[PDB]
Design an enzyme around this catalytic site. Structure first.
Site, PDB file in Angstrom:
ATOM      1  N   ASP A  15       0.787  -1.106   0.105  1.00  0.00           N
ATOM      2  CA  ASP A  15      -0.008  -0.082   0.149  1.00  0.00           C
ATOM      3  C   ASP A  15       0.651   1.312  -0.212  1.00  0.00           C
ATOM      4  O   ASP A  15       0.186   2.554   0.081  1.00  0.00           O
ATOM      5  CB  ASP A  15      -0.940  -0.026   1.237  1.00  0.00           C
ATOM      6  CG  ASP A  15      -0.180   0.044   2.630  1.00  0.00           C
ATOM      7  OD1 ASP A  15      -0.961  -0.230   3.575  1.00  0.00           O
ATOM      8  OD2 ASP A  15       0.750   0.531   2.699  1.00  0.00           O
ATOM      9  N   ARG A  29       0.595   6.933  -0.061  1.00  0.00           N
ATOM     10  CA  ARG A  29      -0.398   5.681   0.464  1.00  0.00           C
ATOM     11  C   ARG A  29      -1.377   5.502  -0.677  1.00  0.00           C
ATOM     12  O   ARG A  29      -2.060   6.435  -1.093  1.00  0.00           O
ATOM     13  CB  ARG A  29      -0.846   6.147   1.574  1.00  0.00           C
ATOM     14  CG  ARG A  29      -2.039   5.354   2.280  1.00  0.00           C
ATOM     15  CD  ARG A  29      -1.459   3.946   2.560  1.00  0.00           C
ATOM     16  NE  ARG A  29      -2.570   3.319   3.434  1.00  0.00           N
ATOM     17  CZ  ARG A  29      -3.334   2.184   2.928  1.00  0.00           C
ATOM     18  NH1 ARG A  29      -3.423   2.090   1.636  1.00  0.00           N
ATOM     19  NH2 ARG A  29      -4.160   1.591   3.870  1.00  0.00           N
ATOM     20  N   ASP A  34      -6.583  -1.667   1.182  1.00  0.00           N
ATOM     21  CA  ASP A  34      -5.981  -2.324   2.528  1.00  0.00           C
ATOM     22  C   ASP A  34      -5.102  -3.578   1.993  1.00  0.00           C
ATOM     23  O   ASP A  34      -5.789  -4.458   1.702  1.00  0.00           O
ATOM     24  CB  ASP A  34      -7.022  -2.672   3.542  1.00  0.00           C
ATOM     25  CG  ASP A  34      -7.352  -1.308   4.207  1.00  0.00           C
ATOM     26  OD1 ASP A  34      -6.610  -0.357   4.484  1.00  0.00           O
ATOM     27  OD2 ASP A  34      -8.667  -1.470   4.681  1.00  0.00           O
ATOM     28  N   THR A  35      -3.956  -3.554   2.136  1.00  0.00           N
ATOM     29  CA  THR A  35      -3.294  -4.632   1.794  1.00  0.00           C
ATOM     30  C   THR A  35      -2.720  -5.381   3.104  1.00  0.00           C
ATOM     31  O   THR A  35      -2.497  -4.574   4.015  1.00  0.00           O
ATOM     32  CB  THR A  35      -2.125  -4.533   0.880  1.00  0.00           C
ATOM     33  OG1 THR A  35      -1.386  -3.351   1.789  1.00  0.00           O
ATOM     34  CG2 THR A  35      -2.528  -3.867  -0.326  1.00  0.00           C
ATOM     35  N   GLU A  37      -0.193  -7.045   5.869  1.00  0.00           N
ATOM     36  CA  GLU A  37       0.955  -6.419   6.536  1.00  0.00           C
ATOM     37  C   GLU A  37       2.028  -7.264   6.510  1.00  0.00           C
ATOM     38  O   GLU A  37       2.020  -8.660   6.395  1.00  0.00           O
ATOM     39  CB  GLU A  37       0.727  -6.305   8.001  1.00  0.00           C
ATOM     40  CG  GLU A  37      -0.551  -5.631   8.464  1.00  0.00           C
ATOM     41  CD  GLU A  37      -0.722  -4.243   8.082  1.00  0.00           C
ATOM     42  OE1 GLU A  37       0.077  -3.343   8.381  1.00  0.00           O
ATOM     43  OE2 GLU A  37      -1.582  -3.844   7.530  1.00  0.00           O
ATOM     44  N   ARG A  76       2.173  11.423   4.144  1.00  0.00           N
ATOM     45  CA  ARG A  76       2.078  10.604   2.813  1.00  0.00           C
ATOM     46  C   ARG A  76       0.883  10.958   2.072  1.00  0.00           C
ATOM     47  O   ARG A  76      -0.194  11.326   2.405  1.00  0.00           O
ATOM     48  CB  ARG A  76       1.835   8.935   3.389  1.00  0.00           C
ATOM     49  CG  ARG A  76       2.719   8.550   4.315  1.00  0.00           C
ATOM     50  CD  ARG A  76       2.523   6.956   4.333  1.00  0.00           C
ATOM     51  NE  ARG A  76       1.101   6.824   5.234  1.00  0.00           N
ATOM     52  CZ  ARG A  76       0.512   5.815   5.469  1.00  0.00           C
ATOM     53  NH1 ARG A  76       1.270   4.512   5.170  1.00  0.00           N
ATOM     54  NH2 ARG A  76      -0.661   5.820   6.007  1.00  0.00           N
TER      55      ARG A  76
END
Length: 130
Positions: A15, A29, A34-35, A37, A76
């Site tokens: 992300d 970002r 939502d990727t 972790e 970001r």
């Protein structure tokens, strides 16, 4: 919305990516995704390898800010990133390597598009949806 040129400095993970934008290094970002972790959730490394390969192999990188806030609390940039005309945010969702995230501060131009890609990956039980 308009696409602006950028240069890949360094892939960070699924992300996030570091780009030279308007002649200055900046961290971005990816909007609406939502990727998993890596620092190491399931498919975390897959998502990272995916964006890294897509961004590093691209001839042209472009950043597209949405109509809402352009930077998060951590400095970001919040944008849709394109690699040779293909949106990394969308490709990620479509490949089942990221879920569509909640809209943030009015940045929802591409929410339905990603919503569609995500339904398709789910139906295909692709990766995260395995």
């Amino acid at each position: 919305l308009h696409k602006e040129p950028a240069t890949l400095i360094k892939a960070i993970d699924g992300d996030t990516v570091k780009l030279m934008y308007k002649g200055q290094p900046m961290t971005f970002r990816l909007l609406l995704v939502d990727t998993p972790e890596t620092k190491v959730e399931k498919y975390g490394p897959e998502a990272s390898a995916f964006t890294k390969k897509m961004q590093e192999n691209a001839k042209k990188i472009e950043v597209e800010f949405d109509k809402g806030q352009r930077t998060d609390k951590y400095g970001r940039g919040l944008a849709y990133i394109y690699a040779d005309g293909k949106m990394v945010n969308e490709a990620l969702v479509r490949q089942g390597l990221a879920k569509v995230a909640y809209v943030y501060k009015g940045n929802n131009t591409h929410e339905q598009l990603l919503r569609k890609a995500e339904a398709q990956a789910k139906k295909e039980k692709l990766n995260i949806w395995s």
